[PDB]
């Protein structure tokens, strides 16, 4: 075991689309793999560093996904295309950054292509971002030409022979740049001297400081928030990536820089889990994988402590033992089995039979905590799915089932009547990456229907009510008789049911009966057909006839009590109420207060977030669809936002006939 806690950079590639995100990590990889895909992390070394590349989702708008990713992650290299400029969405990767407070770096990718502007993505980052950035590098050439770059804190640079990455000579700084390099060194000091007492007493002196003091006092402000290095070149034509490589080992964080992750004790708690590998062990579970040749996948990050091969740990998210068999490092192009993963480093562990996304894994001995909040959201949009021609079914009953292991989170059912195939889950994105994850990855060819809210039913007010089922149904005769007490049964607790039957009066045997056709009825409701919940069921009085009785007969007999009595007890629809953050540009603070409103929203408060305003606010589900759109038609593409259930809601009186 080699490792030194000091020494390891945990990173994260964030990008608009199409900045390089996928290009430059190929190249990373490419550089750092040179002595003697995806997956969720990889390793590899420079300079005598460990450097876990953190794979972002992508596509930012699962913000499950990013805030899970964004503990994990210490440092983020943020990728711009410097052709286009810095385009809308942009602005919201720079938010989660800030929203983290993970400590980062720029590199403008691209200072090869036609349209590339440097100093267009430098201003728009002190403007939009307000990331006030400081100038590391300045290219030589300009789009074509674009040969050289050279480093203005050591003042030397680099000319690059082809674009291969295989040919690189350090070149004094030629003369149509050293007035320009000058300059930027010159600011670059200032820069320093704001962290630095040592250096501001220097600088003012004249005296021009050493290399260890600037970039001990840049990499200072870095960690701390108030900087934002750039960087330059192109990663297609593989100039200035070991570059970046270098200033991800000087500037970027070790798991010993950075605020210590705070948990929660089984009592309430607040601790703060501290980086020692000594300590009792905590980690966190972030990527279940399903590999070729080995078996499940489950990536971890450790926080404090060690987790040792062939081995034991607690799972305090469900409870239970679970044995670590081995444990795997990822490389480029290899696998690495490994005897130990200690406090700070990650990578991916074999065996785990009972663990999930998110979960908490503890040492044995260990102190009880939780890494992440408890409860599990719940199913709010569903959709329709119907498969082509039998042999896709078979296939797409086996797919779901193939695929409900690492994403318990979606639920599936059938349709009360037609019979379908109905798919639920936290949102819209949610869903509409599971599709697409079918056709491609699992092959199933079949037609999706337009997402539709998840509504509830229930009863307001107390009733007594009786079914009966007598009739002559297929050559024999059918009795069935019960009189039930329903009640309202406060909110999210759910179905309740008690028999208090005296005499025999309604047998033994038929009560289970009794109960599956309650059930069934409860599933589709007299008034949008949606799921009845939150009520008490009582079942006090009945009778039978000797030998008509049957399961059956109790079955629609209690069917019918209970429509019967959903429908007397003055019903209500209920909708699922969101809660929802919304970043927006300081300025157009009440273009979207006067949006929220005419969603039928309730304001919650409003407090700064970098140079930006979050807005936060319950907003029916209801009133949310194609948000993104309207966000972004009134922010001028700017704007960004998150989306969480919190509650069930009565619907408004005017909202209930638009619905029936
Ligand atoms: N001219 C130029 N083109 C580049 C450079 N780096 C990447 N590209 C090109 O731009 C495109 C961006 O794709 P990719 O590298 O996957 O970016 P990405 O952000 O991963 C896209 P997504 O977020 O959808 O996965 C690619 O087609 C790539 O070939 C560069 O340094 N210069
Ligand atoms: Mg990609």
Same mark, same amino acid.
């Given at each position: 075991?080699?490792?030194?806690?000091?020494?390891?950079?945990?990173?994260?590639?964030?990008?608009?689309?199409?900045? =390089?995100?996928?290009?430059?990590?190929?190249?990373?990889?490419?550089?750092?793999?040179?002595?003697?895909?995806?997956?969720?992390?990889?390793?590899?070394?420079?300079?005598?560093?460990?450097?876990?590349?953190?794979?972002?989702?992508?596509?930012?708008?699962?913000?499950?996904?990013?805030?899970?990713?964004?503990?994990?992650?210490?440092?983020?290299?943020?990728?711009?295309?410097?052709?286009?400029?810095?385009?809308?969405?942009?602005?919201?990767?720079?938010?989660?950054?800030?929203?983290?407070?993970?400590?980062?770096?720029?590199?403008?990718?691209?200072?090869?292509?036609?349209?590339?502007?440097?100093?267009?993505?430098?201003?728009?980052?002190?403007?939009?971002?307000?990331?006030?950035?400081?100038?590391?590098?300045?290219?030589?050439?300009?789009?074509?030409?674009?040969?050289?770059?050279?480093?203005?804190?050591?003042?030397?640079?680099?000319?690059?022979?082809?674009?291969?990455?295989?040919?690189?000579?350090?070149?004094?700084?030629?003369?149509?740049?050293?007035?320009?390099?000058?300059?930027?060194?010159?600011?670059?000091?200032?820069?320093?001297?704001?962290?630095?007492?040592?250096?501001?007493?220097?600088?003012?002196?004249?005296?021009?400081?050493?290399?260890?003091?600037?970039?001990?006092?840049?990499?200072?402000?870095?960690?701390?928030?108030?900087?934002?290095?750039?960087?330059?070149?192109?990663?297609?034509?593989?100039?200035?990536?070991?570059?970046?490589?270098?200033?991800?080992?000087?500037?970027?964080?070790?798991?010993?820089?950075?605020?210590?992750?705070?948990?929660?004790?089984?009592?309430?708690?607040?601790?703060?889990?501290?980086?020692?590998?000594? =300590?009792?062990?905590?980690?966190?579970?972030?990527?279940?994988?399903?590999?070729?040749?080995?078996?499940?996948?489950?990536?971890?990050?450790?926080?404090?402590?060690?987790?040792?091969?062939?081995?034991?740990?607690?799972?305090?998210?469900?409870?239970?033992?679970?044995?670590?068999?081995?444990?795997?490092?990822?490389?480029?192009?290899?696998?690495?089995?490994?005897?130990?993963?200690?406090?700070?480093? #990650?990578?991916?562990?074999?065996?785990?039979?009972?663990?999930?996304?998110?979960?908490?894994?503890?040492?044995?001995?260990?102190?009880?905590?939780?890494?992440?909040?408890?409860?599990?959201?719940?199913?709010?949009?569903?959709?329709?799915?119907?498969?082509?021609?039998?042999?896709?079914?078979?296939?797409?009953?086996?797919?779901?089932?193939?695929?409900?292991?690492?994403?318990?989170?979606?639920?599936?059912?059938?349709?009360?009547?037609?019979?379908?195939?109905?798919?639920?889950?936290?949102?819209?994105?949610? #869903?509409?990456?599971?599709?697409?994850?079918?056709?491609?990855?699992?092959?199933?060819?079949?037609?999706?229907?337009?997402?539709?809210?998840?509504?509830?039913?229930?009863?307001?007010?107390?009733?007594?009510? +009786?079914?009966?089922?007598?009739?002559?149904?297929?050559?024999?005769?059918?009795?069935?008789?019960?009189?039930?007490?329903?009640?309202?049964?406060?909110?999210?607790?759910?179905?309740?049911?008690?028999?208090?039957?005296?005499?025999?009066?309604?047998?033994?045997?038929?009560?289970?009966?009794?109960?599956?056709?309650? +059930?069934?009825?409860?599933?589709?409701?007299? #008034?949008?057909?949606?799921?009845?919940?939150?009520?008490?069921?009582?079942?006090?009085?009945?009778?039978?006839?000797?030998?008509?009785?049957?399961?059956?007969?109790?079955?629609?007999?209690?069917?019918?009590?209970?429509?019967?009595?959903?429908?007397?007890?003055?019903?209500?629809?209920?909708?699922?109420?969101?809660?929802? +953050?919304?970043?927006?540009?300081?300025?157009?603070?009440?273009?979207?207060?006067?949006?929220?409103?005419?969603?039928?929203?309730?304001?919650?408060?409003?407090?700064?977030?970098?140079?930006?305003?979050?807005?936060?606010?319950?907003?029916?589900?209801?009133?949310?669809?194609?948000?993104?759109?309207?966000?972004?038609?009134?922010?001028?593409?700017?704007?960004?936002?998150?989306?969480?259930?919190?509650?069930?809601?009565?619907?408004?009186?005017?909202?209930?006939?638009?619905?029936?």
């Amino acid at each position: 075991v080699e490792y030194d806690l000091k020494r390891l950079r945990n990173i994260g590639i964030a990008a608009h689309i199409d900045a =390089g995100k996928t290009t430059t990590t190929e190249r990373i990889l490419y550089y750092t793999g040179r002595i003697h895909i995806t997956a969720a992390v990889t390793t590899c070394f420079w300079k005598d560093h460990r450097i876990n590349i953190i794979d972002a989702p992508g596509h930012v708008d699962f913000t499950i996904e990013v805030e899970r990713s964004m503990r994990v992650l210490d440092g983020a290299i943020v990728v711009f295309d410097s052709s286009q400029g810095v385009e809308p969405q942009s602005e919201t990767v720079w938010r989660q950054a800030e929203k983290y407070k993970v400590p980062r770096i720029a590199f403008a990718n691209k200072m090869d292509k036609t349209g590339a502007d440097l100093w267009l993505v430098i201003r728009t980052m002190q403007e939009r971002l307000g990331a006030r950035p400081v100038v590391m590098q300045l290219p030589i050439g300009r789009e074509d030409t674009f040969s050289g770059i050279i480093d203005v804190l050591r003042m030397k640079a680099y000319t690059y022979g082809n674009d291969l990455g295989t040919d690189i000579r350090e070149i004094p700084i030629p003369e149509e740049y050293l007035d320009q390099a000058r300059e930027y060194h010159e600011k670059l000091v200032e820069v320093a001297a704001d962290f630095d007492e040592n250096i501001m007493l220097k600088y003012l002196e004249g005296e021009e400081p050493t290399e260890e003091e600037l970039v001990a006092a840049i990499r200072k402000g870095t960690i701390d928030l108030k900087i934002t290095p750039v960087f330059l070149g192109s990663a297609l034509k593989n100039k200035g990536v070991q570059l970046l490589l270098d200033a991800v080992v000087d500037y970027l964080p070790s798991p010993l820089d950075i605020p210590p992750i705070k948990g929660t004790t089984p009592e309430g708690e607040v601790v703060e889990i501290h980086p020692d590998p000594n =300590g009792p062990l905590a980690a966190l579970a972030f990527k279940i994988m399903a590999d070729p040749y080995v078996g499940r996948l489950t990536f971890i990050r450790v926080y404090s402590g060690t987790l040792t091969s062939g081995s034991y740990v607690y799972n305090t998210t469900k409870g239970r033992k679970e044995r670590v068999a081995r444990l795997l490092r990822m490389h480029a192009n290899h696998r690495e089995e490994v005897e130990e993963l200690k406090a700070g480093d #990650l990578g991916a562990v074999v065996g785990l039979k009972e663990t999930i996304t998110g979960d908490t894994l503890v040492g044995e001995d260990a102190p009880r905590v939780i890494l992440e909040s408890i409860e599990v959201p719940e199913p709010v949009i569903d959709v329709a799915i119907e498969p082509k021609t039998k042999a896709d079914q078979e296939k797409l009953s086996q797919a779901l089932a193939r695929l409900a292991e690492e994403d318990p989170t979606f639920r599936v059912s059938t349709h009360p009547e037609t019979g379908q195939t109905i798919i639920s889950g936290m949102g819209e994105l949610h #869903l509409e990456i599971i599709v697409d994850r079918l056709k491609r990855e699992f092959k199933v060819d079949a037609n999706v229907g337009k997402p539709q809210v998840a509504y509830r039913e229930t009863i307001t007010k107390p009733v007594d009510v +009786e079914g009966k089922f007598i009739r002559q149904t297929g050559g024999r005769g059918q009795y069935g008789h019960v009189k039930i007490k329903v009640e309202p049964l406060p909110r999210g607790s759910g179905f309740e049911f008690v028999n208090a039957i005296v005499g025999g009066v309604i047998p033994k045997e038929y009560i289970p009966a009794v109960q599956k056709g309650i +059930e069934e009825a409860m599933q589709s409701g007299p #008034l949008i057909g949606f799921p009845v919940v939150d009520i008490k069921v009582t079942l006090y009085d009945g009778s039978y006839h000797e030998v008509d009785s049957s399961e059956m007969a109790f079955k629609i007999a209690g069917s019918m009590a209970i429509k019967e009595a959903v429908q007397k007890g003055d019903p209500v629809i209920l909708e699922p109420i969101m809660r929802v +953050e919304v970043t927006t540009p300081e300025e157009y603070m009440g273009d979207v207060i006067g949006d929220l409103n005419a969603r039928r929203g309730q304001i919650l408060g409003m407090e700064p977030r970098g140079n930006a305003q979050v807005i936060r606010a319950f907003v029916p589900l209801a009133e949310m669809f194609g948000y993104a759109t309207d966000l972004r038609s009134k922010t001028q593409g700017r704007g960004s936002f998150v989306m969480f259930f919190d509650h069930y809601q009565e619907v408004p009186k005017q909202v209930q006939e638009k619905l029936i």
